[PDB]
């Protein structure tokens, strides 16, 4: 018999993104080639099957630095990290292949699905 | 020119609640009278003006244990902690006064507003 606040989840995610932009309580650095991205482990796990697996591992859960596979493009990662914290995906003709490959690697099934749909249309 | 995934924020919050239920990556204990509640600092900050102030403080940001004011009712806190992680508020005739008082203390303005509306109706 609960009541529900429709905008609560969106407002929580907006505040988590504000903490990210101000580098507050970020507990991990994701290294993609030369590029470094600071984030919250919980948000990464909530969005990605790959980070979920990494941070539930008894040894990796304690690492402050995670290095991604050298084939991963920093821009594709940046677009996906922004999507994790905002629900908005900056999908463009020039980045769609790098975004799909990065989403497949990160195990972000809904991003993979829309990339496959957008590629099929073109 | 981004696209948006409507269910993303709700899915993120659902996964953060699953991490909470399994005690994964919880980094703080909130003590309310004798009762203890494990949670994620980022989620608490995203939902509450009081926790936002506490964990942006250079000294308090590093505490693993936070003791609330002894007037705070553990059940009122439990109902609000569940709301933070689910968007669902278990508001009942027998708990509304304790829920409103706890929401005022935690600075959760939308919960305070609905409690004031529900009290006025009765």
């Amino acid at each position: 018999s609960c009541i529900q606040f429709t905008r609560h989840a969106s407002d929580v995610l907006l505040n988590l993104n504000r903490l990210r932009s101000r580098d507050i309580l970020t507990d991990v650095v994701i290294v993609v080639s030369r590029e470094q991205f600071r984030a919250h482990k919980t948000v990464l796990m909530a969005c990605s099957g790959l980070f979920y697996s990494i941070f539930t591992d008894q040894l990796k859960c304690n690492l402050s630095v995670i290095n991604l596979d050298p084939e991963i493009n920093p821009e594709g990662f940046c677009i996906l990290l922004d999507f994790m914290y905002t629900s908005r995906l900056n999908l463009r003709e020039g980045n769609i292949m790098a975004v799909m490959a990065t989403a497949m690697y990160l195990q972000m099934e809904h991003v993979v699905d829309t990339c496959r749909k957008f590629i099929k249309a073109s | 020119s981004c696209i948006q995934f409507t269910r993303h924020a709700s899915d993120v919050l659902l996964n953060l609640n699953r991490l909470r239920s399994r005690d994964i990556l919880t980094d703080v204990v909130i003590v309310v009278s004798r009762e203890q509640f494990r949670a994620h600092k980022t989620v608490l900050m995203a939902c509450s003006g009081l926790f936002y102030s506490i964990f942006t403080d250079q000294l308090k940001c590093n505490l693993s244990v936070i003791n609330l004011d002894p007037e705070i009712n553990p059940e009122g806190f439990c109902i609000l902690l569940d709301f933070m992680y689910t968007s669902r508020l278990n508001l009942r005739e027998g708990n509304i006064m304790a829920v409103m008082a706890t929401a005022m203390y935690l600075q959760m303005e939308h919960v305070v507003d609905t409690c004031r509306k529900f009290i006025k109706a009765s």
Binding site: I3, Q4, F5, T6 | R88, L89, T114
Partner: peptide
């Protein structure tokens, strides 16, 4: 607020 809604009835979910």
């Amino acid at each position: 607020w809604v009835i979910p």
